[PDB]
Amino acid sequence: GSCKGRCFELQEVGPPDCRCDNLCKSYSSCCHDFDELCLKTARGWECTKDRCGEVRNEENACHCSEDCLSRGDCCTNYQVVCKGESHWVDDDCEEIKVPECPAGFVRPPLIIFSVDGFRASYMKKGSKVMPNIEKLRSCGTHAPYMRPVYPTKTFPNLYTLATGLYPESHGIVGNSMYDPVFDASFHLRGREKFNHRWWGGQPLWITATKQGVRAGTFFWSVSIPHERRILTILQWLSLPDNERPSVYAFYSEQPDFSGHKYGPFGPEMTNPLREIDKTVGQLMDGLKQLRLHRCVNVIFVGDHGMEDVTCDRTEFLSNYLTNVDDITLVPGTLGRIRAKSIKYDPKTIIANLTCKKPDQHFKPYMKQHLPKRLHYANNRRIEDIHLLVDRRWHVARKPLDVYKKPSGKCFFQGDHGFDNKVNSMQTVFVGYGPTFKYRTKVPPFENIELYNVMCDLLGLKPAPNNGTHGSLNHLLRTNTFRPTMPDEVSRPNYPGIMYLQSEFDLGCTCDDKKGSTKERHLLYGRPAVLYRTSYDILYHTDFESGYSEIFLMPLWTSYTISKQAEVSSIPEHLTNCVRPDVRVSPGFSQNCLAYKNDKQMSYGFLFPPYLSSSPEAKYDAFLVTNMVPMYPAFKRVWAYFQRVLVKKYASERNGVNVISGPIFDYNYDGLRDTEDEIKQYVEGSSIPVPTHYYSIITSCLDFTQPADKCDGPLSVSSFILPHRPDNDESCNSSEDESKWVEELMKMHTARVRDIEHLTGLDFYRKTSRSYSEILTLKTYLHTYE
Ligand SMILES: *[C@@H]1O[C@H](CO)[C@@H](O[C@@H]2O[C@H](CO)[C@@H](O[C@@H]3O[C@H](CO)[C@@H](O)[C@H](O)[C@H]3NC(C)=O)[C@H](O)[C@H]2NC(C)=O)[C@H](O)[C@H]1NC(C)=O
Ligand SMILES: CC(C)CCC[C@@H](C)[C@H]1CC[C@H]2[C@@H]3[C@H](O)C=C4C[C@@H](O)CC[C@]4(C)[C@H]3CC[C@]12C
Ligand SMILES: [Ca+2]
Ligand code: NA
Ligand code: NA
Ligand code: NA
Ligand SMILES: [Zn+2]
């Protein structure tokens, strides 16, 4: 019943006996002598010259006696002050080609150094503010920033780091959330979060344990000082082989707490950054002390950034809604609206939150209409009504929920939780160790990708997650995972002139009654259909398409627009022209009368007639197989994209290749719908209505080369535009399309990977680039930041 000899034990001693481990204070179960035996403080944390060779005093927090190296519990600077050694930060960086671990180490240990609220821009003030972190950054592997998940809150991001899952998949969709099945609420302050029912997926410490890899307990009670946390990881690393963990975790509540108090750019932020770097210095000094500084893989990682947010910048739903007392709001940098259950109508609530104030600093969303890149909808804990708060702003229920002590006060000057594309929300990643690359800069990536890497760093088979395994191979000098292209499931048909124009009774009227193009319009090979379906390849002068016979529309439409291409007007005799495609059966073609009968639905073309190379080739653009059902409100967005924006991108990027097509996601799970999951069709027909329309715009990273003659890395920008019957999302949609369309498309920017999940297609299968390069390209997100 005492902590003698079992201080910070890794053993699973539970209720009701008193424990002595990392979270005994959190579970309120420490033994009586835990503080006096395990949390010692005497003589501080740093050795002095007078303490060198001291008589061992069991009272002391750490020891400077000659025998302390044997015990593994020296102060982290013992060798520096006593044995005349240098600080790890003062040493010149030497490349770690192979792990230099003591005998008995079966794998290079992984220390995850989580820092709460560490903005990416905090690294700009380094070298002297953060000498130890700067050495890790410049001499290891770093990205300029790492993209967190939405919401950019602590618990959703830390668990995303641990599982590689979107919060909608691993369940921690917010710091606070309500589960209608549990009829209970989750909060980071409380005991309910310790209930395992809230945590889906498989975190890293569970993936490791299930595969015979010992994990140190990742979580530390706030009562434990950081020096004691580092000392405990160092003592754990001195355990025997059969007891020593292979993966550890240090969590710093800083610089989040000071960033919340003084804002990200405050001068009071350098002392916490110096404090964290001191802890980083203590870890590296301790590792070098244990001869582990060239054996351990250290990941310096943050969960999110920090934005200037003051209470003076708050939106109040009482200024929009008639009875906010009937509403439960998750307030702050994001908004989640629930029925309080004490006349609650989400349609009326959405309408009266939509573009009501001229500079409205939030936008309401039905969660299935949120930008798909956020992947924040497929969970019963995500409320149907969501508010995207503008950066630097808050949303609250009523004006009495804000709190300010003195005149014009605001207890906090910084906050986070915004859209994870926001640059202030970007956090840091530094990988230092034998498995990481030396002095290497990697492009920014999303924290959903780290779980795969940490599993690779530990020899672990990752649980199914939302990282693209292989996209971060360029961070590692050794790759345990070699990605392979998925097999094409459905082979394409290549129909000739099978049907006469006379056998068509589709109600279509038009006033006119091979590789040669693959080379030009299909630059990276045809997409692979990764599901069972019947579809045909259709060749034309200006575009190629994979036309689905089940969906009566192309799954994709590929075409290249040169830098010097010319945008022509639709000739007036062809304004309502839809010609039948003699290569496609009448039964597998759309009916033009179905669009007449459907008074809410119109139609558009995947390849734009505006970008036809000749008035003769323009007739192919009006084929029934280039036609997709489009709401007239969406046609405003699509026509502007097709007749102005594609040309603009071709003129800026020295030509572009465009792959456009429909997306069906009626259950908003981010995956392509089956035929039975499509909940809307064109009235009186089996023509399905897409929920989105994607486009993948690829060019040459070397803009001095045209898109069709590029012999190097590609540059991609993609979007998944919501196919909505109104433009309610765009508050300036009354104006010309040059004042709201491109802004709307930037908000719905997407990774090619997002489109692949949503379409069952695999792009970029025929390039001069390695597959790991392409996977990095597929996960790229053009943020417009
Ligand atoms: C992010 O990653 C998640 C985990 O990989 C994905 O969620 C998984 O979706 C799968 C398919 O919808 C589910 O898998 C199995 O589906 C078959 C259907 O044939 C069923 O028999 C199984 O019961 C079912 N899974 C089981 C046994 O639970 C997964 O359940 C589900 N996994 C999780 C953890 O949610 C997401 O789809 C992915 N997101 C995106 C956008 O790709
Ligand atoms: C208050 C803080 C200082 C510490 C908070 C700790 C808390 C978030 C941790 C402690 C134990 C964790 C669970 C445990 O490690 C095992 C599992 C099983 C795994 O399948 C899913 C995750 C889960 C439930 C962990 C969730 C996070 C917990 C409760
Ligand atoms: Ca779906
Ligand atoms: Na040919
Ligand atoms: Na119509
Ligand atoms: Na509008
Ligand atoms: Zn946090």
Side-chain angles (χ1 to χ4, degrees), residues 523-524 649-650 652-658 696-703 705-708 710 712-717 764 777:
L523 303 179
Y524 329 107
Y649 303 150
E652 297 174 324
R653 301 160 61 169
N654 198 354
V656 293
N657 178 265
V658 186
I696 296 157
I697 297 139
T698 321
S699 69
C700 200
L701 221 232
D702 182 3
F703 50 82
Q705 307 200 284
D708 67 329
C710 175
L714 308 180
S715 173
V716 70
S717 55
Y764 303 114
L777 175 80

Side-chain angles (χ1 to χ4, degrees), residues 595-602:
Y595 290 102
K596 169 176 289 153
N597 297 164
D598 197 320
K599 288 108 201 171
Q600 305 308 305
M601 182 67 46
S602 182

Side-chain angles (χ1 to χ4, degrees), residues 51 79 118 202 225 320 361 421 453 484 588 592 618 727:
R51 283 194 61 189
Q79 284 219 308
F118 201 107
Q202 187 178 104
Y320 300 79
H361 307 105
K421 94 201 294 272
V453 181
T484 68
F588 297 133
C592 296
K618 203 183 279 289
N727 285 303

Side-chain angles (χ1 to χ4, degrees), residues 177-197:
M177 38 185 203
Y178 170 77
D179 193 296
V181 164
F182 301 162
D183 192 21
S185 303
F186 179 106
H187 305 287
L188 57 62
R189 288 162 129 160
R191 256 73 182 281
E192 183 56 45
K193 66 163 178 284
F194 294 96
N195 288 341
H196 62 78
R197 63 186 181 168

Side-chain angles (χ1 to χ4, degrees), residues 438-455:
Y438 177 65
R439 297 208 169 144
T440 300
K441 177 142 223 155
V442 306
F445 58 89
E446 313 193 325
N447 70 346
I448 67 177
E449 306 298 328
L450 257 205
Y451 175 70
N452 279 337
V453 181
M454 285 175 300
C455 290

Side-chain angles (χ1 to χ4, degrees), residues 22-23 26-27 155 159 163 172 186 188-190 192-203 205-206 210 217-223 229 251:
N22 284 22
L23 294 171
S26 285
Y27 286 94
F155 266 41
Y159 203 50
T163 68
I172 314 303
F186 179 106
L188 57 62
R189 288 162 129 160
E192 183 56 45
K193 66 163 178 284
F194 294 96
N195 288 341
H196 62 78
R197 63 186 181 168
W198 294 96
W199 310 81
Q202 187 178 104
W205 57 92
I206 297 302
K210 277 172 182 297
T217 165
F218 274 21
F219 318 110
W220 306 84
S221 295
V222 292
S223 325
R229 302 183 191 186
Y251 176 76

Side-chain angles (χ1 to χ4, degrees), residues 116-117 153-154 251 256 303-304 416:
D116 195 336
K153 296 292 203 186
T154 302
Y251 176 76
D256 186 79
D303 56 344
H304 52 66
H416 56 80

